[PDB]
Nucleic acid binder design. Sequence first.
DNA 1: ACGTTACACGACGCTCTTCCGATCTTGGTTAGGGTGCAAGCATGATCCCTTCGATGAATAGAGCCGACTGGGCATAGTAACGCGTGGGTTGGTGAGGTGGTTCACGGTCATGCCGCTTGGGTAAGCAGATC
DNA 2: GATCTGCTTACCCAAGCGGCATGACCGTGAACCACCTCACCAACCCACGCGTTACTATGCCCAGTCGGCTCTATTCATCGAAGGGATCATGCTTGCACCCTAACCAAGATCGGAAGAGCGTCGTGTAACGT
Lengths: 95, 92, 104, 109, 82, 82, 84, 97, 98
Amino acid sequence: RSRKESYSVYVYKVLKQVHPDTGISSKAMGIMNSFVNDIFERIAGEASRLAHYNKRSTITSREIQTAVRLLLPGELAKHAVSEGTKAVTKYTSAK
Amino acid sequence: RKESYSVYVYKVLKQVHPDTGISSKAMGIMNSFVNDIFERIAGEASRLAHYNKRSTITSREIQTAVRLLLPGELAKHAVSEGTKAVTKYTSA
Amino acid sequence: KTRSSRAGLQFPVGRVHRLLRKGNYSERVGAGAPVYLAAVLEYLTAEILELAGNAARDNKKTRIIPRHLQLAIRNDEELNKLLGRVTIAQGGVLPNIQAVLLPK
Amino acid sequence: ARAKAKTRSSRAGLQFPVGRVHRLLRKGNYSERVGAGAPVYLAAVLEYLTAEILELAGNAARDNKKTRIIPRHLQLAIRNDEELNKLLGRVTIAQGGVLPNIQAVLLPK
Amino acid sequence: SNEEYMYAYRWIRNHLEEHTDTCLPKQSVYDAYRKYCESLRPLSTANFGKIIREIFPDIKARRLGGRGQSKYCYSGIRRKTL
Amino acid sequence: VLRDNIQGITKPAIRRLARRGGVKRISGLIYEETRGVLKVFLENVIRDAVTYTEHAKRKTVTAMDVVYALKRQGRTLYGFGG
Amino acid sequence: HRKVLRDNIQGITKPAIRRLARRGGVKRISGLIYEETRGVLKVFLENVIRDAVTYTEHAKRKTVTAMDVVYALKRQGRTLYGFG
Amino acid sequence: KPHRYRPGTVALREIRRYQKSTELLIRKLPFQRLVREIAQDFKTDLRFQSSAVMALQEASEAYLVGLFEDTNLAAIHAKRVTIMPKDIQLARRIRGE
Amino acid sequence: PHRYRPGTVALREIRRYQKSTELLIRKLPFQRLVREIAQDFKTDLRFQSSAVMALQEASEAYLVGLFEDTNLAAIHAKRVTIMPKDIQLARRIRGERA
DNA sequence: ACGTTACACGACGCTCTTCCGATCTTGGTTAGGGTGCAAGCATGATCCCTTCGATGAATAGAGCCGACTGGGCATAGTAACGCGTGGGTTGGTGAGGTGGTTCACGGTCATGCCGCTTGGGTAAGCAGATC
DNA sequence: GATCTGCTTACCCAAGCGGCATGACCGTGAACCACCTCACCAACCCACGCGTTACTATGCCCAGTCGGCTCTATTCATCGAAGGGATCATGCTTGCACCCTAACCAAGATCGGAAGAGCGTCGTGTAACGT
């Protein structure tokens, strides 16, 4: 019956990990969902543009990392690049 | 061996102004403008098709993208030209 | 026989169709979308080139240069709004001196 | 298909769904193919950004002696950090209000 | 003084036509211009480049030819066939 | 039918909007200017939203349509869907 | 076989800033804006060249092409017609 | 005899009060009616889902607040405190509108 | 003497440089400036001539637009001379320095 | 002025598989006006300070020359980059079970928080001085 | 002209407290979509060749640049004035909550045809060489 997906299950998990004793209202959860969707759209669009510019037909981790470096400003870019590299290394190291 | 819009821009210029020539820097700027406007309209049409959970880009999506991007009388005239071209296309 | 002439156009609709299909804009592309896009592109190009020719004939010239393109773009409200953030290489600026700075 | 079905968000240690991000990247009209390591990287970046903004919002909500993050707290956490304010400069947050900044000239003498 | 500038302007204007594809040896054009000017003082080789840059905006200076035998060439002009 | 509702944006609204903006003193002729600016901004955004809702074969302007219309002009809105 | 460049931002001479202002439409120029126009140009160039160098680096190239600068300018909402 | 505040005190109190709150400052019903009147010029008998009106109100209030911040910055730049229509015009022109 | 009264050669230069479409910043110092600026991001990275040319055109257009906005701010401030605070206000309103 | 390694590029004809003009319910949403009620808004005094027009004073930017020098061109050398060409390793689907996920919902409860006093702490103007 | 007080009017907060009112969670369940399975080519990677180039370093020379003098047009810094605005008091006009909501429209499946994708052939431009 009009099953719509969201990030409200995962945003709550990330919030509980950071702040163990701080709930989030259903109106701020919508803002966090919109923020996640917007940042995902920005990064994916930049990655697609990067792939098209180099005539590549595949979005690898390189395209996403370059898109993150292009979009995220300064220190945020460095931190997110480190996070993504660590996550990818852990993923390929654990099958 | 790189595709470009030089020949067609020259044909259009000769259609409107049969005497005035066009330089090479101006031709490059015209090519860049054509590419940029094509990218704008195609991206708007893609977003329109994605919002309504559609998969095809028909003349309707391009028409609505033209309505969205081009301002004022430009949108009206471009929509009229596109509709005329489409109705001429389907009639053999 | 060519599809760009069956629509009574000058821009190519085969090239536009290929760019629309290989540009990853949608899974499928309708047979009437390249025609509409080619018609819109041709109309916009014709409008800008006509204005550029009119601006070049004012300078008693016979060749359209980036200066004439900038003059045509900046002197039409709709075209200026459409190409608002666009910078034209070697196009200069539209001459406009504020009335306060003129002598009296 | 005889396995325990280890989800891709568990191998990478993330909390955001790698599978859902991969599905969105595939049916998002971005490229013909999507490498296997791209959803993991994108999910990690998204999770880091969400964790940072939520940490700042929780910090700005404990100051007001509140347990529940509201839109005003997100706006306070975004408008204060320089990198976040630069990244979300054009973004409007509903019911976020504005930062309490008064010019030094309007104040009395 | 400035008579050489006018003569170079005229020679380039009615002897070279702008064309985005073809490339010409850079020394041949100057030699032909000098031969033309030896019929009545030719512009210096360091100023002929400036003049032809002023006349043609979209002109490049490529260095074509095989390895070791690379010679300079104007890119964007050709002979006016007249 | 509706007519002359821009006066519904009262002076004590344009004021207190300036006050949220951080304005101490307010001229007497700025309320009409603010009403005109609000009218033109609303006309632009509502026109975009109406084209969005007309392409969807609909007759009700959904909040998603308004969000997309605002995003088209660079004013992304968080709180109603993304 | 290379060189190091220092004290170069002041290579954007005061007459160049004056000419830029004249094309802008400025009648009188205060003597303190050259040291500020140079800084504004430096920060704008830093941003654009950072984006262009990132685009080049992703392409596994060692020379910044014109398309890289065009895309770097397009990213910041400043399109450039004339270079492809 | 009655306590009369000097000009500027209540203005500063309102500045500090309305920046601490997040509520909508334009009345909901007049703004909804204005939106309906504006939209009746593009499509006759066009219904409005009662959340797009709220989104329009939030966006319009944010736009007006940002514009008034720019207007105040322009007015202070001219050695003035009162914001004038020329300040709004200059802010909107420099923004690129 | 026949000295020009101040304020008219400025208008002559404005009319000269507004109707002319050449490049105002000298090419070689701007190329060296670009090379120095890129010296901090990655070393041993060359610049195409077209890349330097495009950077110069974009920078000149940006500075000309910024100076138009600065002149507007100066005229709004009951002045004729543009000042550093005028540039700062112009960049602040456009959304470049918060 | 005339032909080719026949490849790029596009168009025509033909299966095969998705995809829309019209309906058919189906019920969830919104605007057919109505009742009260009080709380912002209109209007009007009042006086307050700020902004706006002179008005000298400072001051520094604009012309104007006089030295002077480097950018803007053309040359070459060279280490290196980049495209072209030819061989040699890898993700989506031919898809297909298979089952953990997560999305809605009724409901129950825990507690978070929005409003009535109580009384404190803060700012802030209205009145006392004289070279 | 500013140093202190004689105190009288407008905003938070820890209480007590009510009372909603919103969020977490427990099962339902139930689609539902991520996942793990052999194959199989296009997509990508890599080695080698040269053409070309970005960056080096001479050579010329004049047009642009740097710097000091002079001067006056422009920007400050004060003074008054008066006229816009700010602030407060009354009287409401109209916004703000709940509903008889009836029409109406946004969705979830239906009738086929209409249409697009994907392969097989066939029509038009050219990287250089002679009279």
